[PDB]
C-alpha cells in the first residue's frame, strides 16, 4: 500500500531553494518541490514536471539522491518519496498562489519551519550522500520512529 511521490532539491554550492507551501499537505512549511507521479509517467519525468509546476524552474540534469517512505499512523497509504537533486537549472523561481520560493544559505536552512524528518536527512544531502529512509509520524509534527541509512545506489 504505497503511492509514488517526487521531491526535488535545487542545491547549489552555497545555497538551496525551498518553497513555502501555501495550502494542502505541509502548508506553512518550507519544502522541496514535488508531487504525485502520473499514470504512464516515469518518476524522473514526474520530478521535472513538478519542479516546473511548483517553482517555475526548468531542470536540466537531475540526480537520484534518496528514497524516503513516510507512514502516518491511521493513514493506509505509505508515501514512497523519490528524492532528487539538481545544481543545473534554467529560469528564475516564480511565486504563485501555491508556493513562495526562497534561496537559503546552507548554514541558514530553516529546520524549525520544515518537516521534522528534514533535520535527519539534509545533513546527508548536503554532503552528497545517498540514502534510504523510513519515518513513522503521528500527525504532522511527531516522529514516532525512523530508520535512515546511507547507500551507494538509490
Ligand X SMILES: CC(=O)Nc1ccc2c(c1)ncn2C
Binding site for ligand X (CB under 6 A): 7, 26, 31-32, 70, 79, 114-115, 117-118
Angle, CA 106 vertex, CA 113 and CA 47 arms, to 5° = 75
Cite the annotated binding site by residue number: 6, 21, 25, 31, 33-36, 50, 53-54, 98, 115-118
Q: Give the nearest distance from C-beta 125 to ligand X in angstroms.
A: 9
Least separation, in Å, of the C-beta of 79 and ligand X?
6
Q: In terms of CB distance, is 115 or 131 closer to ligand X?
A: 115
Q: How far apart are the first and last CA of the chain?
A: 20
The residue nearest ligand X at its CB is 31
Q: Are 11 and 87 in contact (CB under 8 A)?
A: yes
Which residues line the annotated binding site for Mg(2+)? 34, 50, 53-54, 98
- Write down the least CB distance from residue 141 to ligand X, Å: 10
8 or 151, CB closer to ligand X?
Answer: 8
Residue closer to ligand X, measured from CB, 50 or 117 = 117
Q: Which helix (H) or strand (E) holds 144?
A: strand 142-151
SS3 of residue 68 by DSSP: strand
Amino acid at each position: 500500500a504505497s503511492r509514488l511521490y517526487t521531491l526535488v532539491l535545487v542545491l547549489q554550492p552555497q545555497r538551496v531553494l525551498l518553497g513555502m507551501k501555501k495550502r494542502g499537505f505541509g502548508a506553512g512549511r518550507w519544502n522541496g518541490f514535488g508531487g504525485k507521479v502520473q499514470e504512464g509517467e516515469t518518476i524522473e519525468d514526474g520530478a521535472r514536471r513538478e519542479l516546473q509546476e511548483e517553482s517555475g524552474l526548468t531542470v536540466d540534469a537531475l540526480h537520484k539522491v534518496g528514497q524516503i517512505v513516510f507512514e502516518f499512523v491511521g493513514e493506509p497509504e505509505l508515501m514512497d518519496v523519490h528524492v532528487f537533486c539538481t545544481d543545473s537549472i534554467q529560469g528564475t523561481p516564480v511565486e504563485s498562489d501555491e508556493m513562495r520560493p526562497c534561496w537559503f544559505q546552507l548554514d541558514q536552512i530553516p529546520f524549525k519551519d520544515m518537516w521534522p524528518d528534514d533535520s535527519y536527512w539534509f545533513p546527508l544531502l548536503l554532503q552528497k550522500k545517498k540514502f534510504h529512509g523510513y519515518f513513522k509520524f503521528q500527525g504532522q509534527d511527531t516522529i514516532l520512529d525512523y530508520t535512515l541509512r546511507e547507500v551507494d545506489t538509490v
